[PDB]
Task: inverse folding
């Protein structure tokens, strides 16, 4: 009844949520963004498997050989002291600490910390980052620290997935794009947020129209060539139009480019449209393994169109009840 | 205390070992070779993770979402009837049978069955095989059915790893190479078997010499460009010479080309030579996850040079005792 630890399976955990008192955004959403970026980079570009558990409150038995912890700590030298972001990588087999970082976040060093994190993991894991990974990040990242904070706040609304969160994501990203129009990826994230909003409330129109200009623009920017996010947009657009084969093709390319909780949800969605519930539930369960918790659960149940977990994903319905 | 099934983790199981009575080789080693080929192809060329448990007698709790079973079955129409190789892929989450094949092996259809298996898995898993995978297989496979049977018998001796097994592997592969000199990969497998033998008994010489001609030849055959097996040979050769950096470099390229139990053992071996036991034990435990059982255990403890599992791999020593 021993469970064998798998040294190439990694959990990512978060603790001390809210240095002091309620949230408290800013630092939390930055850390959530970073952890999602580590997870997706590793799932996509290495033979490591990562469960991003940042949004998961539950301690369950895992065969994960390694655990990456993110914790906001204070030394305790005074009242309302400044936090540091403690990040540790532990080997659960041999007990050792593989990496132990203490980051002070400053309003300019957000990109630098994240880069340091990814270099450090590369070394601790003997995992070189591939050219495609390095070229994808130069395409998706802003250059100024504070734009990354802002981006990750909008991104965290996206993760949440509810109407109000998405409306907030959209408006934040419109701001970001206004202050830095070169930041193409922000436009792409805004376009994804906007198609998703519309997908769920398909009888609405702003000055019309609108969303179509945005989406028409975005799929033509040569800069966004060969990014998953453009395939996510194409998938959603084709599903809304009931062009299921085109949606299928699009999301499968997206998955080739990025192994993410969201791509597997979108694939589940397309499978339901194909009348293939068992393939759908399998995709949703893959999504849940990648990022377990209320955000992903929320997206399975609500994203694009509504989905009954009890009827369509019985394995997950039963798992969550147990 | 629920364990979440991971739909991209696959166990491969074997049953009915020995259609009838003792072994019984031929069909068994063919099936072992096929299962090792499925495992390594999937680990290497997809985001699936496979535990090849064909050589593992133990039932332990696994979060594997899917299980591939290989079983030798008889209908029971007469005495000493002919076996069929039953191969099923089951989804442990939703209970369903994803693939159910009944193969009759004939002395000519060995390549054809294996190909059919790999096409079928590709479809059942929605997993297209990449160009590098398809080009690697055309390079490593013979064309005549019976050569594959012979190859996999020698390969199975390799898996076993003991002196007598390797001597048998070597002689079988010398035969194979004599009857089909175009079958370059057989020469490579023979060269790998031969360096490994020599590594373990470094004070022996045949007509001298010998092994060096074989190894000198093999690393020059342009046909074997960009195959893991050449990097395995270079790794072993450099370790024997105490050229640790060169061995390190070689095995890490090998691992880029093929994610296999053996590459991770070889890497563990190089780590010990680097004075890095914790990195070694981590590599060995990766090897054990890839192919758990006595063969891999045997290679950890004996391959190239001797290694104490109790002192060098305490996590595994303790796991196996529990």
Result:
């Amino acid at each position: 009844s021993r469970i064998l630890l798998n040294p190439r399976d990694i959990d990512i955990n978060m603790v001390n949520k809210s240095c002091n008192s309620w949230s408290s955004p800013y630092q939390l959403s930055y850390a959530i963004g970073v952890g999602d970026l580590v997870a997706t980079s590793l799932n996509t570009f290495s033979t490591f498997m990562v469960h991003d558990k940042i949004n998961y409150n539950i301690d369950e038995p895992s065969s994960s050989g390694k655990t990456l912890s993110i914790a906001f700590v204070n030394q305790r030298q005074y009242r309302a002291q400044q936090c540091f972001m403690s990040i540790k990588l532990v080997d659960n087999a041999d007990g050792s600490t593989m990496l132990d970082k203490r980051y002070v976040i400053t309003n300019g060093n957000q990109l630098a910390i994240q880069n340091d994190l990814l270099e450090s993991l590369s070394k601790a894991l003997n995992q070189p980052w591939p050219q495609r990974m390095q070229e994808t990040l130069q395409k998706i990242l802003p250059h100024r620290g504070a734009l990354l904070t802002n981006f990750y706040q909008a991104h965290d609304y996206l993760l949440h997935g509810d109407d109000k969160s998405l409306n907030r994501a959209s408006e934040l990203l419109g701001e970001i794009v206004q202050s830095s129009p070169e930041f193409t990826y922000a436009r792409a994230e805004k376009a994804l947020v906007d198609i998703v909003r519309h997908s769920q409330h398909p009888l609405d129109e702003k000055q019309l129209a609108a969303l179509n200009t945005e989406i028409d623009n975005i799929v033509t920017l040569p800069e966004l060539n060969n990014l998953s996010i453009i395939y996510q947009i194409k998938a959603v657009s084709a599903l809304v139009k009931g062009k299921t084969d085109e949606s299928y093709q699009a999301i499968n390319t997206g998955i080739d480019l990025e192994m993410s909780w969201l791509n597997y949800v979108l694939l589940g969605k397309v499978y339901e449209m194909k009348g293939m519930n068992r393939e759908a539930a399998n995709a949703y369960l893959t999504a849940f393994n990648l990022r377990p918790g209320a955000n992903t659960l929320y997206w399975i149940e609500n994203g694009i169109f509504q989905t009954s977990v009890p009827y369509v994903v019985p394995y997950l319905d039963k798992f969550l009840a147990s």
